[PDB]
Amino acid sequence: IKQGIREVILCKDQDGKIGLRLKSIDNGIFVQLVQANSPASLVGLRFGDQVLQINGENCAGWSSDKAHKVLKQAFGEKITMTIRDRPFERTITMHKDSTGHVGFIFKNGKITSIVKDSSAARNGLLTEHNICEINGQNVIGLKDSQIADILSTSGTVVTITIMPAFIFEHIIKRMAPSIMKSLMDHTIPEV
């Protein structure tokens, strides 16, 4: 999670898609879903990202509807965006013990309990928090067992990006669970 406002240049695919859905939150515009194999995922937009400008125009107080309209119109040749990195989220680094645990209970991706004398405890992991990423891979919409599997298949170091549930639940609203399961880019970035 950068303190960074950064710039991305986006290019519509052949179908006129950039693979993005945006959502109005507290008078900003935030990324609600980034699609696998999209211009948006290639240029490295992330769920939780805030779009400050599109083609030099300020997003403050746009409705979701309008931001979708703005994107639809733009000459797909070059859409430029100004992005603040996942402002509502924080990262925590943890270390698995000998048992290979980091010490929490989560349920529907929401953390619900911290285990005494765990790495999770030492690091001040919080409950009422939705897991957004693990080691920089988006895990939103995956089932808990799949999330569990990623934590198993992980190094001894584990990195989790988390978002206050009230905020997460207001972001995903109006997005069908299946869309999230199927289309939200759950891949490791490309180089």
Side-chain angles (χ1 to χ4, degrees):
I1 311 296
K2 310 171 186 60
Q3 300 168 2
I5 310 186
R6 76 179 180 241
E7 201 181 292
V8 302
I9 293 84
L10 253 149
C11 182
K12 285 185 175 163
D13 72 7
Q14 304 203 271
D15 301 5
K17 292 214 206 85
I18 76 181
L20 198 59
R21 286 294 270 181
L22 300 171
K23 170 59 105 62
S24 162
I25 306 281
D26 299 328
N27 274 272
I29 290 293
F30 290 77
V31 169
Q32 167 181 78
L33 183 143
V34 175
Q35 202 188 344
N37 311 304
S38 67
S41 62
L42 295 163
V43 301
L45 291 178
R46 276 183 290 299
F47 174 102
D49 280 340
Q50 179 172 3
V51 177
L52 305 191
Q53 288 88 47
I54 306 192
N55 284 324
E57 294 207 305
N58 283 338
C59 290
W62 291 0
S63 81
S64 325
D65 272 314
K66 181 184 185 174
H68 297 148
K69 212 162 167 178
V70 180
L71 292 178
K72 208 172 188 178
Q73 296 171 187
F75 321 150
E77 161 74 304
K78 174 159 300 186
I79 319 187
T80 67
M81 288 190 206
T82 298
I83 306 297
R84 190 176 305 258
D85 191 58
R86 289 168 297 160
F88 296 133
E89 313 162 56
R90 287 185 288 126
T91 284
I92 318 298
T93 287
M94 270 149 309
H95 295 239
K96 289 148 91 165
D97 62 20
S98 51
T99 325
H101 288 73
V102 303
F104 60 100
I105 294 188
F106 73 99
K107 196 171 176 295
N108 306 137
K110 187 164 86 184
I111 308 166
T112 47
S113 162
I114 321 296
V115 168
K116 261 149 276 192
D117 291 86
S118 62
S119 194
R122 285 185 287 284
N123 285 284
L125 191 67
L126 300 184
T127 66
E128 204 58 4
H129 273 78
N130 274 265
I131 306 161
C132 287
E133 307 183 7
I134 300 173
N135 298 311
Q137 166 177 350
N138 175 318
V139 299
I140 295 169
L142 301 183
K143 327 193 84 208
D144 285 334
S145 56
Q146 314 202 237
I147 294 173
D149 286 340
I150 295 164
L151 286 171
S152 283
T153 67
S154 184
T156 42
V157 179
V158 183
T159 274
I160 313 180
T161 306
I162 73 171
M163 182 186 298
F166 193 72
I167 300 175
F168 180 82
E169 293 297 327
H170 182 200
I171 282 187
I172 69 180
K173 214 168 211 76
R174 304 309 207 242
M175 182 149 71
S178 46
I179 300 168
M180 273 187 245
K181 195 142 151 61
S182 280
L183 288 154
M184 180 82 66
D185 175 29
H186 303 132
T187 47
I188 301 282
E190 163 197 343
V191 58

